[PDB]
Design a protein around this ligand. Structure first.
Ligand SMILES: Nc1ncnc2c1ncn2[C@@H]1O[C@H](COP(=O)(O)OP(=O)(O)OP(=O)(O)O)[C@@H](O)[C@H]1O
Ligand SMILES: Nc1ncnc2c1ncn2[C@@H]1O[C@H](COP(=O)(O)OP(=O)(O)OP(=O)(O)O)[C@@H](O)[C@H]1O
Ligand SMILES: Nc1ncnc2c1ncn2[C@@H]1O[C@H](COP(=O)(O)OP(=O)(O)OP(=O)(O)O)[C@@H](O)[C@H]1O
Ligand SMILES: [Mg+2]
Ligand SMILES: [Mg+2]
Ligand SMILES: [Mg+2]
Lengths: 267, 494, 437, 118
């Protein structure tokens, strides 16, 4: 299946991996797959950066960073599923069920079975993609969990015109390592290095703080008419060389707190 | 405008009533007879006994195959006379007969291991008592099956009791109370004798036995008549859960059923086979269908001495008939399928089974797969458990950390920079042969095999977060660990 | 050609196991079991036995896949005779399962020719009386992880299923997949009475050549499609015959490292999954140099490369923690303690003699937590992540001393010991002199 | 804990903004970013940590990390206040500086007592 590659700077390994893993036909996609990583790497940035590379594939998005537990995931899921369905099949009829009707994965399964037996009459089969960003990062998390979400292609009947797929994102690797016996595909992102985080920042925050006000302030607080944006980027650049040549020692290969301290001490 | 603070919509409220029967006559003179009643005493469950018969019916038939042994398997299955356990019959049937002659409130407790014919023998005692109801000389009375294990909430006893004595629907906190109202407040001349039997009380009353307390509190009247029984495995229960004053004041009768003797075992299992024992069949030439008194007429038989050894081995442990009977069936299975494998018919003049294969069926139950498995693993787990035993040899600790065992491991290796097997598994485990690959403190696959054994059950990991100081324990033995250890040619010498 | 692309897809779904029920592949090293259990199922499909049985094998060993396969074979001549039931004990409970039973029981009965209504006990007794009390249709359950139903006290449903097996007239087929070995041990008496106790295990690999011919089979074509099918077969066979192939050496690796296939398939997929033209396929599977990239980036960031990318400040303080934990009894350590030994190290370094700068307590305040969040330290009487609900619940009820006491004096703990790091590091460092107590 | 005080917040918000305009949604952060497409109006919140000092700073940290997860809908604003009793430098290094960086951005400061200036 023709997949446009995102010609990225720094993750063309994982690009290869997942653009190979996944295409429109579900058969050449796995049943359940992880994309573990670490913060700042833009794992979440690059997933949608790939969906840019492939529009005709669609996915749902959840962020249980804000949710707390299991039932709220159930409810949000039962919402977004049929929401997405009917929003993207407008002509289709429905009897839209209450998403708050769910209070347990069985009930989610039951109502999805109802979704499907009402969506029975499709022309071709379809698998979609679910997204749970920070499923490690929950706040009353216990260890009896991930196996269950693996087992969703388990109890679904095989005659589904509409199927789904799961997507994850973790950090530590400890509780990952707790469970890899299930022989799972997985793709990963090493914590960057200094030229790497450098170039990520000179390509990412360049346009931001090149197009923040305090430039346009200072240029005319000083009132000096000898200027060009080459040199604007240039002075920003060497300024950031100074930033990082200072505080690489302070942090290493991160971006977030660097952005914070930039915003504060830039002016 | 208002908002409910939390919703319940997947509720399934049950349409069952809170008004007991005590408040639909409103006087002692105001009451009719339940015996002169169509809805009481269960004249309506039969329809829901037959309403669901047709749901699963078909008539598909294509090239039926039928063979020798299966008819004997089903001669031998538990779903059907017995003279083996007959003095308890002659005693409890005597007691119940004299009881319904007395019209008293008598109580009885029995226990016994699963596989004692307790449910069998009792269900047959009361079938004989059904035929005694078919005498039409004893007062008619009614059975009550109680499978609390086929019930969810153990107060539903009262509910189902009322919905089967009346067919009327309430909650327990109306039903049992209306039932006490039904029991003591009601005289005899129209209230009926009912017989009831409780099954496996060990899990039913787990909290405080207030349910069964209520029950045994109902069992102590002189104006009310009932026939009560129960089943368990332990014996101290009536005095354990109650205490002594209650169980003593009631003054019931206690018994338990035991393991049967090997002779009775063989007697009975053959008693379920005499219709087919030593029989001769007309037998077709293609399908081998064994049809009874292009066709043979051959004989069938089974090893009697094998009956002897098979009953003999398991009569001494428990006396579980079911175990004996499955051993029989599985021996028949291996015989039949080896026979089929001889000719190789496909799928679309003597035949006898042996002591050899009877015992082949009886033995693999006790022959554990774990040993051949743990021997047939990779090298790594064997190596690691061997290191564990090395530590157990070095300290006699009965327990080890992760860091200590990993130190033992590295030492157990780097000592043996001389053995060949460890010479040849050398470089292909940390960075795997080639360059471009930096080293790693631990080996590959150690986390894998760790979890592998954890799932296996041999390994026990306490709850901590540190990778190093987490305490670790092995579950089985060190001897058997050596019965895996030296079986490797390379391990026995190191 | 896209004939080859379709062939990629062909061999890919052959790699999965996602084929029609004539090309689905099974091997002689498990045909003893395959030909066992097709027979064990059709005895209750068509010959109407009520056999009870429990499989045993570990994860990723193709148990449920094979129930699926044999029944999928069965479908093509038997569209009618049976009813499928899949389940799971983590997914379900002792309570929400029975409602799924009613649901499926009601909503596939429709596919050929009420139940789900009522309370818990009501729909319970509805299913009871339907099952307890010309031809009957056969029934097959597929439990998964009965371990959940292997609890201590009640687990009544299992007793009731097996009483249904014995007592009933319908063929009650029961399969159990799990991961533990001693399963019979868990049980109370009545289960050991009602259950057959006949329980089956799986085979292991007993030699390399088994895995070799398995690779051959799963990379062998059984249909003429593309201009490189015979090429594929002959290439496979001639490379796989060689014991000197890299890929045979990885076969050895699974034979010794893991001894289990599905991880291997996972590793094998990306090889084709990236494969774009044919000369690339050839040279790449010849050298297997990209297995190198694979397995370098596979477990790359577990323990080592993570310490390979950090500042020197982290190293100094980690040393200040290491040597003093060595000095200590439990190896416990705190913030300012490490700060003290750190500055001592620097005093020594600057006393033996471009220059050096040390990092104020504010400068350590930040990165100490970058340290605690990268799994190198922990807390003394620590407990990491609870397993089940009520523990996760009580956790957010009762807080910790460490939660209440301030940042810098809660009793920490360590992951690595000094001499490990001593051997581990590049010893060329300016600090390598300082890596020894 | 975190989740409870979140439920308090959402209960207050929905039972406040409903009756002022005249179906149920659960108590979660989805609701706030879903405020537009139930009632139509935009919203601006203000948070008063009443006794700022006597509380679990961990639970606090968790909460505020949760609360920063909703600045991506371009239709809402909020504001926080700390009603302090001791001092900033007493506690601005008691809590993790992760929280505190952005809290360097846009702040305000008052001297606050009964006896202001005689
Ligand atoms: N390959 C890349 N090309 C360009 N920019 C990148 C790349 N990787 C990361 N970035 C930058 O780093 C930022 C990190 O964003 P993001 O929050 O997605 O990281 P993350 O690791 O996903 O964080 P989280 O732990 O919250 O998931 C991105 O928004 C992006 O600006
Ligand atoms: N004397 C006998 N005659 C015929 N069959 C027997 C005899 N003794 C045992 N059996 C067989 O063994 C089984 C024993 O059943 P039993 O009444 O002991 O069940 P149970 O112990 O009540 O079960 P549980 O303990 O699980 O409630 C019967 O199903 C029957 O087929
Ligand atoms: N529908 C399917 N299509 C293709 N391959 C499958 C399918 N289902 C399972 N498999 C293969 O079978 C393996 C898992 O099978 P199975 O679940 O029987 O193993 P297991 O050890 O029983 O795992 P578990 O005990 O968790 O069920 C995987 O390697 C997978 O590739
Ligand atoms: Mg992200
Ligand atoms: Mg019984
Ligand atoms: Mg399985």
């Amino acid at each position: 299946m023709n997949v446009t590659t995102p010609e990225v700077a720094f993750r063309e390994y994982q690009t290869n991996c997942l653009a190979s893993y996944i295409s429109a036909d579900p058969d050449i996609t796995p049943s359940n797959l992880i994309l573990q990583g670490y913060s700042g790497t833009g794992k979440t940035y690059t997933l949608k950066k790939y969906f840019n590379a492939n529009p005709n594939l669609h996915a749902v998005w959840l962020e249980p960073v804000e949710l707390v537990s299991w039932k709220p995931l159930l409810q949000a899921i039962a919402r977004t599923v049929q929401y997405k369905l009917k929003t993207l099949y407008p002509n289709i009829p429905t009897t839209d069920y209450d998403p708050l009707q769910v209070e347990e994965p069985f009930l989610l399964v039951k109502t999805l079975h109802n979704i499907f037996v009402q969506y029975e009459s499709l022309q071709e089969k379809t698998c979609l993609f679910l997204i749970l960003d920070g499923f490690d990062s929950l706040q009353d998390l216990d260890a009896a969990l991930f196996n269950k979400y693996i087992k969703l292609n388990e109890l679904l009947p095989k005659d589904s015109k509409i199927n789904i797929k799961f997507i994850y994102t973790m950090l530590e690797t400890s509780f990952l390592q707790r469970y890899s016996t299930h022989c799972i595909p997985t793709v990963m992102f090493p914590r960057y290095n200094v030229d790497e985080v450098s170039t990520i920042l000179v390509m990412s925050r360049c346009g931001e703080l090149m197009e923040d006000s305090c430039l346009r302030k200072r240029i005319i607080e000083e009132q000096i008419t000898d200027c060009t944006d080459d040199q604007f980027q240039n002075v920003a650049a060497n300024f950031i060389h100074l930033i990082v040549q200072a505080f690489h020692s302070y942090t290493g290969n991160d971006i977030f707190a660097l952005n914070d301290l930039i915003d504060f001490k830039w002016p | 405008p208002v908002i409910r603070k939390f919703t319940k919509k997947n509720v399934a409220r049950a349409k069952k009533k809170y008004t007991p029967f005590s408040k639909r006559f409103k006087s002692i003179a105001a009451i009719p007879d339940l015996t002169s009643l169509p809805e009481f005493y269960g004249n309506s469950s039969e329809l829901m006994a037959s309403r669901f018969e047709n749901k699963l019916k078909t008539t598909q038939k294509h090239q039926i195959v039928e063979t020798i042994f299966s008819k004997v398997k089903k001669q031998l299955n538990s779903s059907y006379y017995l003279p083996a356990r007959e003095n308890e019959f002659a005693s409890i049937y005597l007691s119940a007969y004299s009881a319904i002659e007395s019209d008293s409130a008598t109580t009885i407790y029995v226990a016994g291991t699963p596989g004692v014919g307790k449910t069998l023998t009792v269900r047959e005692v009361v079938k004989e008592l059904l035929s005694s109801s078919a005498q039409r000389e004893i007062p008619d009375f009614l059975y009550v099956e109680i499978n609390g294990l086929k019930m969810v909430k153990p107060t539903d006893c009262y509910e189902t009791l009322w919905n089967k004595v009346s067919g009327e629907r309430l909650t327990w906190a109306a039903s049992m109370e209306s039932l006490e109202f039904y029991f003591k407040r009601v005289p005899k001349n129209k209230k009926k004798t009912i017989v009831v039997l409780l099954d496996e009380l060990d899990a039913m009353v787990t909290k405080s036995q207030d349910i069964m307390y209520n029950f045994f509190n109902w069992t102590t009247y002189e104006n009310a008549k009932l026939i009560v029984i129960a089943v368990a495995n332990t014996m101290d229960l009536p005095e354990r859960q109650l205490g002594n004053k209650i169980t003593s004041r009631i003054g019931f009768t206690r018994i338990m059923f035991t393991g049967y003797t090997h002779e009775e075992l063989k007697n009975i299992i053959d008693l379920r086979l005499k219709g087919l024992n030593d029989s001769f069949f007309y037998v077709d030439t293609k399908t081998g269908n064994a049809i009874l008194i292009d066709v043979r007429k051959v004989r069938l038989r089974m090893s009697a001495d094998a009956i002897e050894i098979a009953s003999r081995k398991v009569a001494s442990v428990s006396g579980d008939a079911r175990r004996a009977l499955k051993v029989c069936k599985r021996a028949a299975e291996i015989a039949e399928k080896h026979y089929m494998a001889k000719h190789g018919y496909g799928y679309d003049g003597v035949q006898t089974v042996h002591i050899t294969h009877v015992m082949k069926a009886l033995n693999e139950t006790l022959n554990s797969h774990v040993i051949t498995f743990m021997t047939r693993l990779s090298f790594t787990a064997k190596l690691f458990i061997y290191a564990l035993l090395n530590l157990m040899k070095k300290n006699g600790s009965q327990e080890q950390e992760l860091g200590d065992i990993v130190d033992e491991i590295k030492l157990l290796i780097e000592v043996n920079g001389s053995n060949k097997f460890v010479m040849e598994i050398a470089k292909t485990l940390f960075q795997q042969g080639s360059d471009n690959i930096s080293e790693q403190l631990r080996i590959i696959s150690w986390d894998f095999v760790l979890n592998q054994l954890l799932d296996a059950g041999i390994l026990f990991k306490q709850t901590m977060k540190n990778d190093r100081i987490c305490c670790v324990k092995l579950n089985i033995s060190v001897e058997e660990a050596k019965r895996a250890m030296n079986e490797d040619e390379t391990l026995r010498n190191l | 050609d896209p004939g080859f692309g379709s062939l990629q897809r062909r061999l890919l779904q052959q790699l999965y196991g996602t084929l029609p029920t004539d090309e689905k592949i099974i091997f002689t090293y498990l045909q003893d079991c395959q030909q066992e259990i097709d027979r064990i199922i059709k005895q209750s499909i068509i010959q109407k036995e009520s056999h009870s049985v429990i499989l045993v094998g570990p994860r990723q060993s193709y148990k449920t896949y094979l129930l699926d396969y044999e029944l999928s074979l069965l479908q093509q001549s038997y569209k009618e005779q049976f009813i499928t039931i899949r389940l799971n004990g983590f997914i379900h409970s002792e309570q929400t399962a029975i409602n799924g039973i009613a649901t499926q029981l009601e909503q596939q009965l429709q596919k050929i020719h009420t139940i789900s209504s009522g309370s818990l006990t009501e729909v319970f007794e509805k299913i009871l009386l339907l099952l307890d009390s010309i031809t009957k249709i056969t029934v097959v359950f597929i439990f998964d992880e009965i371990d959940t139903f292997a609890g201590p006290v009640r687990q009544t449903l299992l007793y009731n299923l097996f009483d249904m097996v014995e007592h009933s007239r319908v063929p009650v087929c029961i399969f159990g997949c799990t991961t533990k070995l001693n399963i019979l041990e868990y049980l109370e008496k009545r289960v050991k009475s009602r259950f057959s106790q006949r329980v089956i295990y799986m085979p292991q690999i007993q030699n390399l050549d088994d895995m070799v011919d398995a690779v051959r089979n799963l990379l062998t074509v059984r249909s003429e499609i593309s201009p490189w099918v015979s090429q594929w077969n002959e290439t496979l066979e001639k490379e796989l015959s060689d014991p000197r192939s890299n890929l045979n050496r990885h076969i050895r690796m699974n034979f010794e490292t893991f001894r289990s296939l599905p991880t291997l398939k996972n590793s094998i997929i990306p090889l084709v999954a990236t494969s774009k033209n044919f000369g690339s396929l050839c040279t790449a599977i010849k050298s297997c140099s990209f297995l190198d990239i694979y397995n370098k980036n596979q477990l790359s960031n577990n323990l080592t490369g993570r310490l390979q990318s950090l500042s020197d400040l982290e190293l100094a303080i980690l040393i200040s923690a290491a040597r003093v934990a060595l000095r200590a009894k439990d190896g416990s350590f705190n913030f300012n303690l490490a700060y003290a030994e750190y500055e001592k190290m620097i005093k020594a370094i600057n006393s033996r003699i471009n220059t050096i700068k040390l990092w104020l307590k504010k400068d350590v305040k930040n990165v100490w937590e970058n340290l605690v969040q990268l799994d190198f330290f922990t807390e003394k009487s620590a407990v990491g992540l609870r397993d089940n609900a009520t523990a996760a619940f009580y956790a957010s009820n009762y807080q910790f001393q460490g939660t209440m006491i301030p940042f810098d004096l809660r009793s920490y703990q360590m992951q690595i010991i000094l001499q490990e790091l001593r051997r581990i590091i590049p010893k060329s460092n300016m600090y390598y002199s300082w890596t020894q107590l | 804990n975190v989740r409870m005080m979140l439920r308090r917040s959402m209960y207050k918000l929905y039972s406040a903004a409903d009756a002022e305009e005249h179906n149920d949604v659960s108590y979660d952060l989805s609701l706030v970013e879903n405020f537009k497409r139930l009632f139509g109006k935009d919203l601006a919140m203000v948070f008063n940590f009443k006794d700022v000092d006597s509380i679990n700073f961990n639970t606090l940290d968790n909460f505020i990390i949760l609360l920063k997860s909703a600045f991506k809908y371009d239709h809402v604003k909020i504001s926080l206040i700390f009603n302090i009793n001791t001092n900033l430098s007493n506690i601005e290094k008691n809590l993790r500086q992760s929280t505190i960086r952005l809290l360097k951005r846009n702040y305000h400061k008052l001297d606050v007592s009964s006896n202001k200036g005689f």
